[PDB]
Design a binder for this molecule. Structure first.
Ligand SMILES: N=C(N)N1CCC[C@H](C[C@@H](C=O)NC(=O)CN2CCC[C@H](NS(=O)(=O)Cc3ccccc3)C2=O)C1
Ligand SMILES: [Ca+2]
Length: 223
């Protein structure tokens, strides 16, 4: 996260870390057995880390759980990043408490201007690379579809939204992918892609979770 602040330990109880011997993506807990993340974070060997603040120190409150399976959206397109969503089933059910809790799915899409909380352990630099130990947070509005499309003409599908600041200085960055975008208590977005980090007129692009609620529900029911 570039331009954000320290969240505070366990204040984003639905944030997960995907680990393969290092932190490579984020994700959100949506029930005791399932995490949502981005299709592009897809790899074998994933250990889901819940209740993490400092990802380098065991502090207490962590639960380390192997993914049992990862489900990339069948229509995911790695050139376009259209349908950039993935579900991960935990080998066993997390223990839900105040530190480790699930985020609700929206029942309707958010409008332009809604303020959301984005969070991750990704690079905190616009230029160069500086990874934090602790979770960082950012408040960012959802931009209008007109602005989003005039920033990335021919690249925005109806399953993507833009959020952030046209002025540069504040954004998600390398490391943050798969992580939540939460707006009024629901998960509206997934960190997906952009152009550099916190560059002027190049806001971050997010997966539009409201378009996937049925798919999520349907796939979880059958697995
Ligand atoms: N929000 C902004 N600006 N981002 C841009 C910096 C990468 C960030 C997250 C990251 C994975 O953790 N996503 C990407 O790597 C998905 N993706 C892969 C292909 C290239 C594309 N643009 S570049 O990396 O900035 C991109 O964003 C997203
Ligand atoms: Ca830790």
């Amino acid at each position: 996260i570039v331009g954000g602040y320290t969240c505070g330990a366990n204040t984003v109880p639905y944030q997960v870390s995907l680990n393969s011997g290092y932190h490579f993506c984020g994700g959100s807990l949506i029930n005791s057995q399932w995490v949502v993340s981005a299709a592009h974070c897809y790899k074998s060997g994933i250990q889901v880390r819940l209740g993490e603040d400092n990802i380098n120190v065991v502090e207490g409150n962590e639960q380390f759980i192997s993914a049992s399976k990862s489900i990339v959206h069948p229509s995911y397109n790695s050139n376009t990043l259209n349908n950039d969503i993935m579900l991960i089933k935990l080998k066993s059910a997390a223990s839900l408490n105040s530190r480790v809790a699930s985020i609700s799915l929206p029942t309707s899409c958010a409008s332009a201007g809604t303020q959301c909380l984005i969070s991750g352990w990704g690079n905190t630099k616009s230029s160069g690379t500086s990874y934090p130990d602790v979770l960082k947070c950012l408040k960012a509005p959802i931009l209008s579809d007109s602005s989003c499309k005039s920033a990335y003409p021919g690249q925005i599908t109806s399953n993507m939204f833009c959020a952030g600041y046209l002025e540069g200085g504040k954004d998600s960055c390398q490391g943050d992918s798969g992580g939540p975008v939460v707006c009024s208590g629901k998960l509206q977005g997934i960190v997906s892609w952009g152009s550099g980090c916190a560059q002027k007129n190049k806001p971050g692009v997010y997966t539009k979770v409201c378009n996937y609620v049925s798919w999520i529900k349907q796939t979880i029911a059958s697995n």
